Amino acid sequence: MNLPSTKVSWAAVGGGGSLV
Amino acid sequence: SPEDFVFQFKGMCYFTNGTERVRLVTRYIYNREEYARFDSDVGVYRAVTPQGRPDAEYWNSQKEVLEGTRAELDTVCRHNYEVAFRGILQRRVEPTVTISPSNLLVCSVTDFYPGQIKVRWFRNDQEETAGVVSTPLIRNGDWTFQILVMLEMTPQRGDVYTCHVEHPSLQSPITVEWRAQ
Amino acid sequence: DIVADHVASCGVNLYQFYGPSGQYTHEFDGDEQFYVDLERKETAWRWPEFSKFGGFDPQGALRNMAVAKHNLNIMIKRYNSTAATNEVPEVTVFSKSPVTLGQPNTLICLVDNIFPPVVNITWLSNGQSVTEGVSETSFLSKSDHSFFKISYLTFLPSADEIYDCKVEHWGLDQPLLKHWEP
Ligand SMILES: *[C@@H]1O[C@H](CO[C@@H]2O[C@@H](C)[C@@H](O)[C@@H](O)[C@@H]2O)[C@@H](O[C@@H]2O[C@H](CO)[C@@H](O[C@@H]3O[C@H](CO)[C@@H](O)[C@H](O)[C@@H]3O)[C@H](O)[C@H]2NC(C)=O)[C@H](O)[C@H]1NC(C)=O
Ligand SMILES: *[C@@H]1O[C@H](CO)[C@@H](O)[C@H](O)[C@H]1NC(C)=O
Ligand SMILES: *[C@@H]1O[C@H](CO)[C@@H](O)[C@H](O)[C@H]1NC(C)=O
Ligand SMILES: [Zn+2]
């Protein structure tokens, strides 16, 4: 019996900030 | 030192009174800061910090995502408990009890599971309350715990010391005696 | 802190830029039930005894790691490339059970307060590196989101034995050497 697990939700693209 | 950036997702299940009260909290973490979360007691995703707002709004707007996460309280938490946890909770590993002087007398209670345990010191069958110091419960990492309990000895070499241990794996308490050579 | 009789993580999904590398495990009341080795793509058990409590389709972990990778990249930008802070780990060494000459035992090296989750834990017998009989846990989670990791050394107690656990971490000024006090 394979156990169930929570799924990681896929983040929304673009939400502010800038790479430094 | 090399730079690093860390992401952590924790699908946590909290159980109380068997599975009568269960709560699912999925945590989205950047480095060590949780920024978004789904709490089954809340029912929708919430931004924990400003950086999680884009996701909370996005995920709550996706029917499949929201309904799927709401269903995890049962499909993950409650079913994992049925298939695996109920059995793990029945796991019993009897502790090994050994006494040796280090004046302090040390009672080493090792290799037991679960972590709930009660260790008491007795001197000539009189329970000792003072002069007793215990280490915190020690997690070995291999599904066993250990704990050490020290007792301040008296000057009388004739005194008989007994370490009394109670644990769920024991029908009867384990008692180990020690007396100077 | 949430109050409960028992707590499980189904599961702990970790992914980091350094490497990059990830980790997938399920924990119950603080111990590792199983993990998915992302390299060989198999669900495995550091303690085979627990396989009877259920298997796991590794593809679930692989999918979650791909999503984790996507999320990390997005969060780095949202947080303006704020790097992880290297915390100072805490090390303790102790035996699994009372030591008796000639009776096999195990030395345990606990490395607590780990962050980021990158560390080298090795064992030294009288100053020399020892690899035989060494094993370790995964990075186990903590509520403050740091981690702890335990390394094991099986050995035959002998007179004149000398053991040290050596820990390398970016949060330390220099490798930490913890001597086992029998
Ligand atoms: C701890 O949890 C138990 C078990 O509760 C039951 O199992 C859970 C997993 C959930 O599915 C619950 O919905 C479910 O009730 C609690 O005991 C249960 O309490 C309820 C309410 O008092 C009892 O219901 C009664 O059932 C009888 C017939 O059996 C009816 O005639 C009554 O009208 C009423 O509906 C239920 O019997 C009882 N079951 C058990 C296992 O004892 C318990 O209350 C809870 N403890 C605490 C401190 O919250
Ligand atoms: C991120 O960078 C933006 C652009 O410079 C700045 O306005 C904002 O205050 C910063 N906040 C963080 C750390 O996300
Ligand atoms: C761990 O050891 C490897 C191999 O020697 C080395 O490349 C790396 O820098 C070490 N990491 C740490 C945290 O010191
Ligand atoms: Zn169901």
The ranges assigned to domains in chain B are 1-90, 91-181
* CA–CA separation, C115 and B66 (whole Å): 31
The CA–CA distances, whole Å, from B145 to C14, C73, C80, C180 equal 26, 39, 43, 19
| C-alpha triplet B24, B30, B33: angle, nearest 5° | 70
Could you tell me if B172 and B166 are in contact, meaning their C-beta atoms sit under 8 angstroms apart? Answer: no
Q: How far is B30 from chain C (nearest CA, A)?
A: 7
Structure tokens given for A6 = 């929570």
- Comparing CB atoms, the residue among A4, A8, A13 nearest residue C74 is A13
Contact C77 A19 (CB under 8 A): yes
Reported structure resolution in angstroms = 1.8
The CATH code that applies to domain C84-182 is 2.60.40.10
Q: How far is B166 from chain C (nearest CA, A)?
A: 19
Name the closest ligand to CA C114.
3
Q: How far is C177 from chain B (nearest CA, A)?
A: 20
* CA–CA separation, B1 and B70 (whole Å): 41
Atom of ligand 3 nearest to the CA of C119: 13
For residue B20, the CA-to-ligand 1 centroid distance in Å is 8
- Comparing CB atoms, the residue among B9, B54, B79 nearest residue A12 is B54
- Comparing CB atoms, the residue among A3, A8, A15 nearest residue C78 is A15
Tell me, rounded to whole angstroms, the distance of Cα B84 from its chain centroid: 17
Taking an 8 Å Cβ-Cβ cutoff, which residues of chain C contact chain A?
A: 10-11, 13, 26, 54-57, 60-61, 63-64, 67-68, 70-71, 74-81
| Residue C180 three-state SS | coil
B91-181 CATH, one of 2.60.40.10, 3.40.640.10, 3.30.70.2740, 3.40.50.620: 2.60.40.10
For residue B21, the CA-to-ligand 1 centroid distance in Å is 11
The CATH code that applies to domain B1-90 is 3.10.320.10
Chain B residues touching C110 at Cβ < 8 A: 141
Structure tokens given for C134 = 């060494």
Experimental technique used to determine this entry: X-ray
Q: What is the CA radius of gyration of chain A?
A: 16
The CA–CA distances, whole Å, from B118 to B100, B132, B156, B177, C35 equal 19, 13, 27, 17, 32
Name the closest ligand to CA C77.
2
Q: Report, at the CATH architecture level, how domain C4-83 is classified.
A: Roll (3.10)
Which residues, at least 6 apart from B181, have a Cβ–Cβ distance to it below 8 Å? none
Q: Is B63 on the interface with A (CB under 8 A)?
A: no
* CA–CA separation, C147 and C89 (whole Å): 9
CA contacts within 13 A on the Cβ side of B80? 29
